[PDB]
C-alpha cells in the first residue's frame, strides 16, 4: 500500500536533538513522490559560523558500497561477472581460500577481517595517521590478511570494509578502467548526479560543502576538523561525495528498477540477517521501522560525517539525513529517527 505523511515537526525535533548531543549541524531532505521536505539546523563550518543547508555537499562514507554494488551487478548483467564464482578466479592468488565468492564479499559473508579495526583503534590518532596517505587496494587487502578469516566462507554476516576494497579491485580488473570512470559512466552521468564525485586521492570537496568534525574518544574533548582527507583507506568502500538530492535520486532510481535488470535487483535484495530489525543484501541494507514498513538504502560513516540514505520499496519516497560529526553514538542513534519520522509519520 502507500505511506503515511512525513512528519516535519518530528524531523525538526530529531535535528534539534542531534545538535544538543554534539553535532555541529544536521539536515534532512525527503523526496515524497514529487513533494520535497527539507530541514536543516546548525553549522556547516563551526569556525566561520556558516549555516548548514540541504544543498551542501558532503562525504557519504559507506553509502559508497551501494555505488560499488551497482557497478558489479551491471557487470553481471553484461556477462562479465558471475556472483558465485570465486574471487580468486578473477584476481588470482588474492585470497587464501578459493571458496570465497563474489556474492559472499558483496554481502559481508566472506570472513575477511576488517583492517579499519587496526587503523582506528584510537579515533583521532588513527585519523591523523591515514588522512594524508595514499594506499593501493592491495595495501589494504594485505592489512586484512595479516589476520585470519573470522568465519568459514558464507557462514555469517560480519561487516568488513575489506569486502568493498575487494569490490573496487574486481571492478578495475574486469573493466580495465578506474572505479571513478565506472561510477561516472554507469551511474553519475545517466542519473545526472551533478553533486556526486569520486576524486580520490584528492582531499578537497568540490563546491559548497559541510565540514566534518571528528569527535575524540575522550568525553569533553575538542572537535577535530576532518573535512579534507584522501579517504584512501576506504576508496570503493567509502570515498564518494554527494548531496541529499543526489542520494535521494540514486536510491529512488535503484529501487524503481532503473540501474540494472530485474533479476540482479532481486539478487541485491536477498537478505542476510544482521540483527532483529536489519538485513544486508549485496551492498544494500534493509531497516525495519516501528510502523511495519521496511526501507532500503545504506548508512554511511567516514570521519566527521554520519549519513542515512533510504528509500521505500518502490522508490517513491527517499530520504537522506546528514549530521556533520562522527564517533558520537548518541548522534548516530538520534539521526536514525529521521527514518521513523519520514516514513512512519506522526505517532
Curated annotation (Swiss-Prot):
Q: Please give the GO cellular component terms listed in this UniProt entry.
A: extracellular region
Molecular function terms from GO: serine-type D-Ala-D-Ala carboxypeptidase activity
Locate the active site: 62
InterPro entries hit by this protein: Bact_CellWall_Synth/Modif, Beta-lactam-related, Beta-lactam/transpept-like
Summarize where substrate binds, as residue positions. 120-123, 159-161, 285, 299-301, 326-327
Q: In which pathway does it act?
A: Cell wall biogenesis; peptidoglycan biosynthesis
Going by the UniProt record, its keywords in alphabetical order are:
Carboxypeptidase, Cell shape, Cell wall biogenesis/degradation, Hydrolase, Peptidoglycan synthesis, Protease, Secreted, Signal
Q: What is its EC number?
A: 3.4.16.4
**What is one GO biological process annotated to this record?**
cell wall organization
Q: Which reaction does it catalyse?
A: Preferential cleavage: (Ac)2-L-Lys-D-Ala-|-D-Ala. Also transpeptidation of peptidyl-alanyl moieties that are N-acyl substituents of D-alanine
Locations listed in the record: Secreted
Q: Which family does it belong to?
A: Belongs to the peptidase S12 family.
The record's function comment reads:
Catalyzes distinct carboxypeptidation and transpeptidation reactions during the last stages of wall peptidoglycan synthesis. Mistaking a beta-lactam antibiotic molecule for a normal substrate (i.e. a D-alanyl-D-alanine-terminated peptide), it becomes immobilized in the form of a long-lived, serine-ester-linked acyl enzyme and thus behave as penicillin-binding protein (PBP).
Q: What is this protein called?
A: D-alanyl-D-alanine carboxypeptidase
